[PDB]
Amino acid sequence: REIITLQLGQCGNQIGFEFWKQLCAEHGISPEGIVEEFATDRKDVFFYQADDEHYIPRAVLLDLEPRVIHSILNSPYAKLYNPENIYLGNNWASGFSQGEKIHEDIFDIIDREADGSDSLEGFVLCHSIAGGTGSGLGSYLLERLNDRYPKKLVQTYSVFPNQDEDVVVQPYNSLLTLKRLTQNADCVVVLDNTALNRIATDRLHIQNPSFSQINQLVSTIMSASTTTLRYPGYMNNDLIGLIASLIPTPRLHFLMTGYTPLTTDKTTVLDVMRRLLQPKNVMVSTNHCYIAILNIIQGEVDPTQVHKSLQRIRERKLANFIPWGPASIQVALSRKSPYLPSAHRVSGLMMANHTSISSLFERTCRQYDKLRKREAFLEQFRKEDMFKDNFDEMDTSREIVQQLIDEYHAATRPDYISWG
C-alpha cells in the first residue's frame, strides 16, 4: 500500500536524494511537486497524494551534525518534497548517545508522517554501515521503530563504505549495527562498495567520480526493486509479499544483489538468464550456496520463451538448490519505465538469499576479532567507555553473529533437518 521512506546519515541522505531525483525524472512530476500530463501509474506508494494537486513525495530526512544536507537543500529537488519532515558523531556509541538525547522530537516527526498517511505498509530506511553520523543513531532509532511499531515492516538499505581498504573502529560499529539489523529488521539489503567500485572502474574510465555514479546504480536498483509496486503489475504490490518468499528463516534475510547491464551506453531472456547466474554479473561479491533466488527482469521483450528459457536453464544443469528444501528460482517480469532514454532497454536484477555473505560476515568478524585481541585499535573515546564500560554488547553481538554463521553453514548443509 503506502510506504514511508526514512533517510538518515550523510550517505543515506545522498542516495535517497538521488533516488528521489530518479523518480522525479521517471514519473510525471515537476521539480515543483505537481502532477503533470505524463503521469498514469500508481503514485501513492512513495508520493503522498497531497491537496495541492501535487504528488508530494514521502521523504523523511533526518541527520546528526549535517554537512552535505545543506547542499541537498539548495537544489530544486529539496522543494520537490516538503511535507515538513525535513530536520537539521563518528562512532557507534557516540551516535547512539546523540540519538538518545534527541529521540523525542524526531520520533514526533515520524509520528506526524505516520498518522499523515491514509495507510501504512512499511518504513524503509536509507543507511550506511559505520557511516559515522548514521551509525549508532540508526541502530538506536531502528530499535525504537521495532519497539514502537510491531505491526509494520522495516526494510534497511545499507552500503559498506570502503575504498578497497579502512577505519579501525568500523568493525566494531558494523558488528553492533549488524546485531541490530539481525534482531530489529525484517529484510536487509547489503552492498559492497569495494566490488561495486572495482566494477565501476572497470566498466568505464570513472575513478574520481565513482561515488556519484554509484548513486545512480543504487537509485536504479532501488527503482527496479519497487517498479512492480509503482507500476501496475500482478504480484507482490505490497512490500511484505515481495519480502516473504526469499526468507526461509528470519535470520537468513540478508539478500545478495545482481544487475545485468555492465554498461548501458535486442536479446532474449535466455541470454540474460545464463548471464546473471554467473559472478561476472554479481555486483556484490566450502563453496557457499544459494538458499533461494528471486529474479526481476525489466525490458522490451516478448515474454513466452521464458518457459522455454526455464527449460533450457534447467537442463543446462548449472545450479542446484538446498538439500532440505524443494526451493526454486522465483521469477517476475516487468516493463522498463519510460521518460529516461536507455540504450538496450533489457535490464535484469536478482534478489537472492545466498550463504556467501556469511563468509563476508566472518571477514568482518575476523577483523573485529583481531582488533579485539590487540586492543590498540578501539581508539578509546570517552563516549564508548560511558556507553558501555564492560563492552559486553560486543560480546552479545559476537555470540549472535557466530550463531548466525553456524546457522548459515548448517543451512548450507542438510543439517537443517537438525539444528545448528
Binding site: P232, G233, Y234, M235, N237, G241
Partner: protein, 60 residues
C-alpha cells in the same frame, strides 16, 4: 468487424473480462482480498447479494 468496433466496443471490453473474471489483473484481486478480508472470513452466506455488489462497486 467495424460495426462491433465503432457502435459498441468489442476489443476494449474483452480486456476487462480477462482482468476480472479470469483474474488477469492481480493488483485488483490483491486489494479486493485485502479490503474484503472481514466480510469474507466471517460468514456472508446469510447476507443479501446486493450489499456484496455494492461493496464491489467501490472496491474496483
Amino acid at each position: 468487424l467495424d460495426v462491433l468496433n465503432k457502435k459498441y466496443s468489442l476489443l476494449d471490453h474483452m480486456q476487462a473480462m480477462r482482468r476480472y473474471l479470469l483474474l488477469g489483473q492481480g493488483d485488483f484481486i490483491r486489494h479486493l482480498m485485502d479490503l474484503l478480508k472481514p466480510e469474507l472470513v466471517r460468514p456472508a452466506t446469510t447476507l443479501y447479494q446486493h450489499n456484496l455488489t455494492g461493496i464491489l462497486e467501490t472496491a474496483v
